[PDB]
Design an enzyme around this catalytic site. Structure first.
Site, PDB file in Angstrom:
ATOM      1  N   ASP A  81      -8.680   6.018  -4.429  1.00 12.26           N
ATOM      2  CA  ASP A  81      -8.093   7.270  -4.904  1.00 12.26           C
ATOM      3  C   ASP A  81      -6.746   7.075  -5.598  1.00 12.26           C
ATOM      4  O   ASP A  81      -5.794   7.804  -5.327  1.00 12.26           O
ATOM      5  CB  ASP A  81      -7.939   8.250  -3.738  1.00 12.26           C
ATOM      6  CG  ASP A  81      -9.272   8.662  -3.142  1.00 12.26           C
ATOM      7  OD1 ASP A  81     -10.318   8.358  -3.753  1.00 12.26           O
ATOM      8  OD2 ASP A  81      -9.276   9.293  -2.065  1.00 12.26           O
TER       9      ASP A  81
ATOM     10  N   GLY B 234     -13.457  17.757  -4.570  1.00 14.70           N
ATOM     11  CA  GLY B 234     -14.620  16.895  -4.496  1.00 14.70           C
ATOM     12  C   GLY B 234     -14.895  16.289  -3.133  1.00 14.70           C
ATOM     13  O   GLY B 234     -13.984  16.054  -2.339  1.00 14.70           O
TER      14      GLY B 234
ATOM     15  N   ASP C 105       0.349   8.333  -3.481  1.00 11.11           N
ATOM     16  CA  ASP C 105       0.087   8.531  -2.057  1.00 11.11           C
ATOM     17  C   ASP C 105      -0.506   7.269  -1.441  1.00 11.11           C
ATOM     18  O   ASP C 105      -1.565   7.306  -0.810  1.00 11.11           O
ATOM     19  CB  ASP C 105      -0.847   9.723  -1.825  1.00 11.11           C
ATOM     20  CG  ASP C 105      -0.862  10.176  -0.372  1.00 11.11           C
ATOM     21  OD1 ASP C 105       0.138   9.933   0.339  1.00 11.11           O
ATOM     22  OD2 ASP C 105      -1.871  10.772   0.060  1.00 11.11           O
TER      23      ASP C 105
ATOM     24  N   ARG D 297      -4.608   4.959   5.057  1.00  9.80           N
ATOM     25  CA  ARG D 297      -5.822   5.800   5.002  1.00  9.80           C
ATOM     26  C   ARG D 297      -6.465   5.703   3.612  1.00  9.80           C
ATOM     27  O   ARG D 297      -7.622   5.985   3.508  1.00  9.80           O
ATOM     28  CB  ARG D 297      -5.480   7.250   5.331  1.00  9.80           C
ATOM     29  CG  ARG D 297      -5.245   8.112   4.105  1.00  9.80           C
ATOM     30  CD  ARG D 297      -5.935   9.449   4.181  1.00  9.80           C
ATOM     31  NE  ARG D 297      -7.357   9.340   4.079  1.00  9.80           N
ATOM     32  CZ  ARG D 297      -8.109  10.038   3.265  1.00  9.80           C
ATOM     33  NH1 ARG D 297      -8.105   9.800   1.973  1.00  9.80           N
ATOM     34  NH2 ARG D 297      -8.911  10.946   3.759  1.00  9.80           N
ATOM     35  N   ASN D 298      -5.708   5.287   2.604  1.00 15.64           N
ATOM     36  CA  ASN D 298      -6.219   5.197   1.242  1.00 15.64           C
ATOM     37  C   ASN D 298      -6.493   3.758   0.829  1.00 15.64           C
ATOM     38  O   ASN D 298      -6.712   3.465  -0.347  1.00 15.64           O
ATOM     39  CB  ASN D 298      -5.244   5.855   0.267  1.00 15.64           C
ATOM     40  CG  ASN D 298      -5.311   7.367   0.317  1.00 15.64           C
ATOM     41  OD1 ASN D 298      -6.377   7.943   0.532  1.00 15.64           O
ATOM     42  ND2 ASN D 298      -4.170   8.020   0.125  1.00 15.64           N
TER      43      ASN D 298
HETATM   44  C1  LIG Z   1     -20.380   3.680   1.711  1.00 13.92           C
HETATM   45  C2  LIG Z   1     -20.100   2.932   3.017  1.00 13.92           C
HETATM   46  C3  LIG Z   1     -19.285   3.852   3.917  1.00 13.92           C
HETATM   47  O1  LIG Z   1     -19.872   4.620   4.678  1.00 13.92           O
HETATM   48  N1  LIG Z   1     -17.950   3.724   3.751  1.00 13.92           N
HETATM   49  C4  LIG Z   1     -17.052   4.473   4.408  1.00 13.92           C
HETATM   50  C5  LIG Z   1     -17.299   5.266   5.527  1.00 13.92           C
HETATM   51  C6  LIG Z   1     -16.273   6.009   6.101  1.00 13.92           C
HETATM   52  N2  LIG Z   1     -16.521   6.766   7.182  1.00 13.92           N
HETATM   53  C7  LIG Z   1     -15.398   7.454   7.853  1.00 13.92           C
HETATM   54  C8  LIG Z   1     -15.560   7.467   9.358  1.00 13.92           C
HETATM   55  C9  LIG Z   1     -16.931   7.991   9.722  1.00 13.92           C
HETATM   56  N3  LIG Z   1     -17.042   8.152  11.179  1.00 13.92           N
HETATM   57  C10 LIG Z   1     -18.386   8.639  11.521  1.00 13.92           C
HETATM   58  C11 LIG Z   1     -18.504   8.837  13.023  1.00 13.92           C
HETATM   59  O2  LIG Z   1     -17.524   9.799  13.455  1.00 13.92           O
HETATM   60  C12 LIG Z   1     -16.190   9.346  13.152  1.00 13.92           C
HETATM   61  C13 LIG Z   1     -16.053   9.133  11.651  1.00 13.92           C
HETATM   62  C14 LIG Z   1     -17.979   7.021   9.201  1.00 13.92           C
HETATM   63  C15 LIG Z   1     -17.912   6.930   7.681  1.00 13.92           C
HETATM   64  C16 LIG Z   1     -14.989   5.964   5.557  1.00 13.92           C
HETATM   65  C17 LIG Z   1     -14.730   5.179   4.436  1.00 13.92           C
HETATM   66  F1  LIG Z   1     -13.473   5.124   3.891  1.00 13.92           F
HETATM   67  C18 LIG Z   1     -15.772   4.462   3.869  1.00 13.92           C
HETATM   68  N4  LIG Z   1     -15.526   3.684   2.813  1.00 13.92           N
HETATM   69  C19 LIG Z   1     -15.623   4.113   1.551  1.00 13.92           C
HETATM   70  N5  LIG Z   1     -16.227   3.331   0.658  1.00 13.92           N
HETATM   71  N6  LIG Z   1     -16.216   3.833  -0.403  1.00 13.92           N
HETATM   72  C20 LIG Z   1     -15.592   5.007  -0.353  1.00 13.92           C
HETATM   73  C21 LIG Z   1     -15.352   5.898  -1.311  1.00 13.92           C
HETATM   74  C22 LIG Z   1     -14.672   7.066  -1.016  1.00 13.92           C
HETATM   75  C23 LIG Z   1     -14.257   7.287   0.287  1.00 13.92           C
HETATM   76  O3  LIG Z   1     -13.585   8.455   0.527  1.00 13.92           O
HETATM   77  C24 LIG Z   1     -13.511   9.017   1.844  1.00 13.92           C
HETATM   78  C25 LIG Z   1     -13.223  10.519   1.713  1.00 13.92           C
HETATM   79  C26 LIG Z   1     -12.525   8.434   2.659  1.00 13.92           C
HETATM   80  C27 LIG Z   1     -12.766   8.447   4.031  1.00 13.92           C
HETATM   81 CL1  LIG Z   1     -14.221   9.147   4.642  1.00 13.92          CL
HETATM   82  C28 LIG Z   1     -11.854   7.904   4.926  1.00 13.92           C
HETATM   83  N7  LIG Z   1     -10.673   7.335   4.450  1.00 13.92           N
HETATM   84  C29 LIG Z   1     -10.423   7.322   3.078  1.00 13.92           C
HETATM   85  C30 LIG Z   1     -11.332   7.868   2.180  1.00 13.92           C
HETATM   86 CL2  LIG Z   1     -10.901   7.790   0.498  1.00 13.92          CL
HETATM   87  C31 LIG Z   1     -14.534   6.315   1.254  1.00 13.92           C
HETATM   88  C32 LIG Z   1     -15.198   5.203   0.905  1.00 13.92           C
END
Ligand SMILES: CCC(=O)Nc1cc(N2CCC(N3CCOCC3)CC2)cc(F)c1Nc1n[nH]c2ccc(O[C@H](C)c3c(Cl)cncc3Cl)cc12
Length: 300
Positions: free
Chosen positions: A178, A27, A160, A164-165
């Protein structure tokens, strides 16, 4: 095609899919805009995270997501976990709508907020002062403990637990993510490195790694590693130790050194979490109470 659960079912047309956030073994996660998540305010907009199958989806992938969905329903709501908000199961792709943490995961939160190094020109009265302070770091650890204590009371094992989680909200509230996943514990590639360079085996308790045994005490071990991550400000555990060396070191009873700028109270908790016998590790309830004492002592 799946049975209808009116308690959780949410109109998919009230969702506006946005930027993909990332993906796991099964997913993908997409950020989305939701209207009327609160039924008392039908036209109110909110930001949510939508979990869905990839275009690779086998039924095993579908089964895992459905399994995760049902776990979410049973665990209940707590401040320090990513909570289920709704689902989309009728006439369209399977959506699992969960809470949205604006600041991303705890590891990247800490790494991006490391204090200014010896290279910056002193501009203003707070040049040496970084975004992160000791009481906030302790608060981060305390909240994760509270969340894990809740999950334990709901008989949920994370398997886990890592920085990061753990996700960070706009108000710096720790939310464990998760926790209800099928993680294929009988076929773990211990040498497998993630796209961001993580080796998940470095968070595994000995009984989990060697004997494939998972308990809440194995999560306590992982929590100890998470403690190390926090007070290294997002550092990677067992620095410069490849998986092959990790195997033998763990068999020799090797433990991580006390990180710099880390009080003995917290390294003491780490080592307690890393006791060989799972029964000699603190419970999450004890961790909550222990960290609470430290937090209150530094919260004048
Ligand atoms: C909905 C608001 C939002 O955008 N939140 C958000 C952005 C991110 N990212 C990751 C970095 C990413 N940047 C973009 C620019 O280039 C570098 C990475 C920006 C968005 C990561 C998060 F954990 C979150 N936070 C999460 N909120 N709710 C979630 C539900 C599942 C979720 O899973 C993803 C795969 C995830 C991620 Cl992406 C990173 N670490 C743990 C997890 Cl579990 C993350 C979030």
């Amino acid at each position: 095609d799946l049975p209808l659960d009116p308690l959780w079912e949410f109109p998919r047309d009230r969702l506006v899919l946005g930027k993909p956030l990332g993906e796991g073994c099964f997913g993908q996660v997409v950020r989305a805009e939701a209207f009327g998540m609160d039924p008392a305010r039908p036209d109110q907009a909110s930001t949510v995270a939508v979990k869905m199958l990839k275009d690779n989806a086998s039924d095993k992938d579908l089964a895992d997501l459905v399994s995760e969905m049902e776990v979410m329903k049973l665990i209940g709501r707590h401040k320090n976990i990513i909570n289920l908000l709704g689902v989309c199961t009728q006439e369209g792709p399977l959506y699992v709508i969960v809470e949205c943490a604006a600041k991303g995961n705890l590891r990247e939160f800490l790494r991006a907020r490391r204090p200014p190094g010896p290279d910056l020109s002193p501009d203003g009265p707070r040049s040496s002062e970084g975004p992160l302070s000791f009481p906030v770091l302790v608060s981060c650890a305390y909240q994760v403990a509270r969340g894990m204590q809740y999950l334990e009371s709901r008989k949920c094992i994370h398997r886990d637990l890592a920085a990061r989680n753990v996700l960070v909200t706009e108000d710096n509230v720790m939310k464990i993510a998760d926790f209800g996943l099928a993680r294929g514990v009988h076929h773990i590639d211990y040498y497998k490195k993630t796209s961001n360079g993580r080796l998940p085996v470095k968070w595994m308790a000995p009984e989990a790694l060697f004997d494939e045994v998972y308990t809440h005490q194995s999560d306590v071990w992982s929590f100890g590693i998470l403690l190390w991550e926090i007070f290294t400000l997002g550092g990677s555990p067992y620095p410069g130790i490849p998986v092959e060396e990790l195997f033998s070191l763990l068999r020799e009873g090797h433990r991580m050194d006390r990180p710099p700028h880390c009080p003995p109270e917290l390294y003491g908790l780490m080592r307690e979490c890393w006791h060989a016998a799972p029964s000699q590790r603190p419970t999450f309830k004890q961790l909550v109470e222990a960290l609470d004492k430290v937090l209150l002592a530094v919260s004048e």
